[PDB]
């Protein structure tokens, strides 16, 4: 929703009481990267005239966004490190910088893995500039978390992707949200009945 | 009243050029049309 | 002007006339004027003008007696226009209309040739509901009996089974494209550029029929066999199938790596359970029918 | 006409540019100048760039556009046919035929790149449609392009 509102109000921003247009576009670009899919990102951020002009003014966040978009990897990671530092410094993004970095790393891994049935951990590490052991541990952690649609064969390092139907994801989300709401409903029931 | 008409016609020009935001060009054309 | 050449100016002279509006002029002369317009337009090779002019004739007029030469000329011009365009269904319809002419009906050879053209063009027409209905009616035609071979060709193209183009050519080719001095062979496939095009189109129709039959009968097939049955190499066969798939005439997924083609769409749970429920409904209906038969037989064989 | 040029020279919206070109054509319709032919040319270019090439044939066949048949409108007719066929080879053939007409920088040479990109994407879609598993070398042989280039384009389309 932050990205949705920011993209709606990117061309009509006047609330300088809160923050400058440079910072506004920076936040908009960050939220758009972490929220929007590739087509929406292309249509809105990568081609919006105002966003492009303000990103021409900004030397760093423009590089970050475009590296993510056009798959220049490991430069996406230096960009993510610097943006993480400034996110931690910022009061607004501070208690979400870890989550944002984790989500952006997951997005980059998913983007790299989507268009390939298999991809060696060596190739992954070469693309991301990181070491094979580090990328292996990161990828395994994210797969265990369940946010990447692949598995990794370790005896002969190779990452093999798969395509689980969206019905499984929707069922898991339905169970989770229904459990939250059912716990709330049950709490209300105990509060009222007695 | 003419100023309000200028604003309304600027909106109408933004409509004619199918678009979501009224712009300086729309306001210019609205002033020209109203006066 | 035309006798002096300069056909374009004579054409122009004619289409300056809006003969469809003249009220005093008799209907026969109006139709003759329109046909002359169409003839000179065709000579000028202005097919769009010829078509729009043709749209000014009510075919109902070719029914109130004395309309034989008029209708024959009209339908021959329509055949010429549709041939120069590329259609075959309209050519078949116009040839059938000519066949329905008493003048062609007599002079046996005339209706021989007319019915041969009708059959050939209904075969050449790409498959659809209209073409299927037309071939149904043409096969139902009784006078096909006189012509031995064209009835058999219609039977082969209306049968729900394969047919090799090699044997098709061997059995029929010599007496459709040429030959048959005793019974003149039509010009639908004559040795002229347009006849070559029509022959290639007939080959395409044969391949389309084979692909349709394989699609409806096969759950799965290999290209090495599909090409063999289509009398094409693997490359031409798969290109033809790709053209059909892109046009959405026939669905087929081609696994090139395994050299496989499957005509079955991916299984949908809705479709599977719908088929199961339809089977159950048919089963219930059939048990009701069979118990009614039980009752009938018991009535007949129980009292005495 | 100038507004229709500046729009679609700055890219963004093509429907507004098409409307501007239609109004310019109505104005230039032999009433006050002979530039109706070039206005119609730009109009057809906008219509094809809108990923709606079927409309070009009707646009040129319209009663008012019928009297403008020539090497400037038939070229856009061929380009629209190529776009409908999703055949990059046919598009290249049309360009080779009408080179000077379609490439002497009449404010369309800046859009031939976009035409090439989108038509290449459409041709790849068409060639891969009748397949469940095909060789990239086979796709290259069918679309007349290098294996690495088609691989990169296919990866981009997948993403």
From Swiss-Prot, chain A:
<feature type="domain" description="PCI">
    <location>
        <begin position="1"/>
        <end position="166"/>
    </location>
</feature>
<protein>
    <recommendedName>
        <fullName>26S proteasome non-ATPase regulatory subunit 6</fullName>
    </recommendedName>
</protein>
<comment type="subunit">
    <text>Component of the 19S proteasome regulatory particle complex. The 26S proteasome consists of a 20S core particle (CP) and two 19S regulatory subunits (RP). The regulatory particle is made of a lid composed of 9 subunits including PSMD6, a base containing 6 ATPases and few additional components.</text>
</comment>
<comment type="function">
    <text>Component of the 26S proteasome, a multiprotein complex involved in the ATP-dependent degradation of ubiquitinated proteins. This complex plays a key role in the maintenance of protein homeostasis by removing misfolded or damaged proteins, which could impair cellular functions, and by removing proteins whose functions are no longer required. Therefore, the proteasome participates in numerous cellular processes, including cell cycle progression, apoptosis, or DNA damage repair.</text>
</comment>
<comment type="similarity">
    <text>Belongs to the proteasome subunit S10 family.</text>
</comment>
Swiss-Prot record, chain B:
<comment type="function">
    <text>Component of the 26S proteasome, a multiprotein complex involved in the ATP-dependent degradation of ubiquitinated proteins. This complex plays a key role in the maintenance of protein homeostasis by removing misfolded or damaged proteins, which could impair cellular functions, and by removing proteins whose functions are no longer required. Therefore, the proteasome participates in numerous cellular processes, including cell cycle progression, apoptosis, or DNA damage repair.</text>
</comment>
<comment type="subunit">
    <text>Component of the 19S proteasome regulatory particle complex. The 26S proteasome consists of a 20S core particle (CP) and two 19S regulatory subunits (RP). The regulatory particle is made of a lid composed of 9 subunits, a base containing 6 ATPases including PSMC5 and few additional components. Component of a complex with USP49 and RUVBL1. Interacts with PRPF19. Interacts with TRIM5. Interacts with NDC80. Interacts with PAAF1. Interacts, in vitro, with the thyroid hormone receptor (in a thyroid hormone T3-dependent manner) and with retinoid X receptor (RXR). Interacts with ERCC6.</text>
</comment>
<comment type="similarity">
    <text>Belongs to the AAA ATPase family.</text>
</comment>
<protein>
    <recommendedName>
        <fullName>26S proteasome regulatory subunit 8</fullName>
    </recommendedName>
</protein>
Swiss-Prot record, chain C:
<keyword id="KW-1017">Isopeptide bond</keyword>
<dbReference type="GO" id="GO:0005737">
    <property type="term" value="C:cytoplasm"/>
</dbReference>
<comment type="function">
    <text>Component of the 26S proteasome, a multiprotein complex involved in the ATP-dependent degradation of ubiquitinated proteins. This complex plays a key role in the maintenance of protein homeostasis by removing misfolded or damaged proteins, which could impair cellular functions, and by removing proteins whose functions are no longer required. Therefore, the proteasome participates in numerous cellular processes, including cell cycle progression, apoptosis, or DNA damage repair.</text>
</comment>
<feature type="modified residue" description="N6-acetyllysine">
    <location>
        <position position="216"/>
    </location>
</feature>
<dbReference type="GO" id="GO:0005576">
    <property type="term" value="C:extracellular region"/>
</dbReference>
<dbReference type="GO" id="GO:0005838">
    <property type="term" value="C:proteasome regulatory particle"/>
</dbReference>
<dbReference type="GO" id="GO:0000502">
    <property type="term" value="C:proteasome complex"/>
</dbReference>
<keyword id="KW-0991">Intellectual disability</keyword>
<dbReference type="GO" id="GO:0005829">
    <property type="term" value="C:cytosol"/>
</dbReference>
<keyword id="KW-0647">Proteasome</keyword>
<dbReference type="GO" id="GO:0034774">
    <property type="term" value="C:secretory granule lumen"/>
</dbReference>
<feature type="modified residue" description="N6-acetyllysine">
    <location>
        <position position="69"/>
    </location>
</feature>
Curated annotation (Swiss-Prot), chain D:
<feature type="domain" description="PCI">
    <location>
        <begin position="13"/>
        <end position="159"/>
    </location>
</feature>
<protein>
    <recommendedName>
        <fullName>26S proteasome non-ATPase regulatory subunit 11</fullName>
    </recommendedName>
</protein>
<comment type="function">
    <text>Component of the 26S proteasome, a multiprotein complex involved in the ATP-dependent degradation of ubiquitinated proteins. This complex plays a key role in the maintenance of protein homeostasis by removing misfolded or damaged proteins, which could impair cellular functions, and by removing proteins whose functions are no longer required. Therefore, the proteasome participates in numerous cellular processes, including cell cycle progression, apoptosis, or DNA damage repair. In the complex, PSMD11 is required for proteasome assembly.</text>
</comment>
<comment type="subunit">
    <text>Component of the 19S proteasome regulatory particle complex. The 26S proteasome consists of a 20S core particle (CP) and two 19S regulatory subunits (RP). The regulatory particle is made of a lid composed of 9 subunits including PSMD11, a base containing 6 ATPases and few additional components.</text>
</comment>
<comment type="similarity">
    <text>Belongs to the proteasome subunit S9 family.</text>
</comment>
<feature type="cross-link" description="Glycyl lysine isopeptide (Lys-Gly) (interchain with G-Cter in SUMO2)">
    <location>
        <position position="63"/>
    </location>
</feature>
């Amino acid at each position: 929703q932050a990205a949705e509102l920011f993209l709606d109000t990117v061309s009509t921003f006047t609330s300088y009481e809160l923050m400058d247009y440079k910072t506004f576009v920076t936040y908009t670009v960050y939220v758009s990267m972490i929220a929007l899919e590739r087509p929406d990102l292309r249509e809105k951020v990568i081609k919006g005239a105002e966003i492009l002009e303000v990103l021409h003014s900004l030397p760093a966040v423009r590089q970050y966004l475009f590296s993510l978009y056009e798959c220049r990897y490991s430069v996406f990671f230096q960009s993510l490190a610097v943006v993480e530092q400034e996110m931690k410094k910022d009061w607004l993004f501070a208690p979400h910088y870890r989550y944002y970095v984790r989500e952006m790393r997951i997005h980059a891994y998913s983007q790299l893995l989507e268009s390939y049935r298999s991809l060696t951990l060596g190739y992954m590490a070469e693309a991301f500039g990181v070491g094979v052991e580090f990328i292996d541990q990161e990828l395994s952690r994210f797969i265990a978390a369940g946010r990447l649609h692949c598995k990794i064969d370790k005896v002969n390092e190779i990452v093999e992707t798969n395509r689980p139907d969206s019905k499984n994801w929707q069922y898991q989300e339905t169970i989770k949200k229904g459990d939250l709401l059912l716990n709330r409903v049950q709490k209300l029931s105990r509060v009222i009945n007695m | 009243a003419e100023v309000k008409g200028v604003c309304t016609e600027a909106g109408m020009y933004a409509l004619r050029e199918r678009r979501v935001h009224v712009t300086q060009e729309d306001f210019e054309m609205a002033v020209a049309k109203v006066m | 002007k035309e006798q002096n050449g300069d056909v374009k100016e004579a054409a122009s002279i004619l289409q300056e006339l809006q003969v469809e509006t003249y009220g005093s002029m008799e209907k026969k002369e109006r139709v003759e004027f329109i046909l002359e317009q169409m003839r000179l337009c065709l000579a000028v090779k202005d097919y769009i003008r010829t078509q729009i002019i043709s749209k000014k004739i009510n075919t109902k007029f070719f029914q109130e007696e004395n309309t034989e030469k008029l209708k024959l000329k009209y339908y021959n011009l329509m055949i010429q226009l549709d041939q120069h365009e590329g259609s075959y269904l309209s050519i078949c319809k116009h040839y059938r209309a000519i066949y329905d002419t008493p003048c062609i009906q007599a002079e046996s050879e005339k209706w021989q040739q007319a019915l041969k053209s009708v059959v050939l063009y209904v075969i050449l027409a790409p498959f659809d509901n209209e073409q299927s209905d037309l071939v149904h009616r043409i096969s139902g035609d009784k006078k096909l009996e006189e012509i031995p071979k064209y009835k058999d060709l219609l039977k082969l193209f209306t049968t729900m089974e394969l047919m090799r183009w090699s044997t098709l050519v061997e059995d029929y080719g010599m007496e459709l494209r040429k030959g048959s001095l005793e019974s003149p062979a039509t010009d639908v496939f004559g040795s002229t550029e347009e006849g070559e095009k029509r022959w290639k189109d007939l080959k395409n129709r044969v391949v389309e029929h084979n692909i349709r039959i394989m699609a409806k009968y096969y759950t799965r097939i290999t290209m090495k066999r599909m090409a063999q049955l289509l009398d094409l190499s693997v490359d031409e066969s798969e290109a033809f199938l790709s053209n059909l798939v892109v046009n959405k005439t026939i669905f087929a997924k081609v696994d090139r790596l395994a050299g496989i083609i499957n005509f079955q769409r991916p299984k949908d749970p809705n479709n599977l359970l719908n088929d199961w429920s339809q089977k159950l409904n048919s089963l219930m209906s059939l048990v009701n029918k069979t118990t009614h038969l039980i009752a009938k037989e018991e009535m007949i064989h129980n009292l005495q | 006409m100038q507004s229709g040029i500046i729009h679609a020279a700055e890219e963004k919206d093509w429907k507004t540019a098409y409307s501007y070109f239609y109004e310019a054509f109505e104005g230039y319709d032999s009433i006050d100048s002979p530039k109706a032919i070039t206005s119609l040319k730009y109009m057809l270019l906008c219509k094809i760039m809108l990923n709606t090439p079927e409309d070009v044939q009707a646009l040129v066949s319209g009663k008012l556009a019928l009297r403008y048949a020539g090497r400037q409108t038939e070229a856009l007719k061929c380009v629209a046919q190529a776009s409908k066929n999703r055949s990059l080879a046919d598009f290249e053939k049309a360009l080779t035929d009408y080179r000077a007409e379609l490439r002497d920088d009449p404010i369309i040479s800046t859009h031939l790149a976009k035409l090439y990109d989108n038509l290449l994407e459409q041709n790849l879609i068409r060639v891969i449609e009748p397949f469940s598993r095909v060789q990239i070398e086979h796709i290259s042989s069918l679309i007349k392009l290098s294996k690495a280039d088609v691989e990169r384009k296919l990866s981009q389309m997948i993403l």
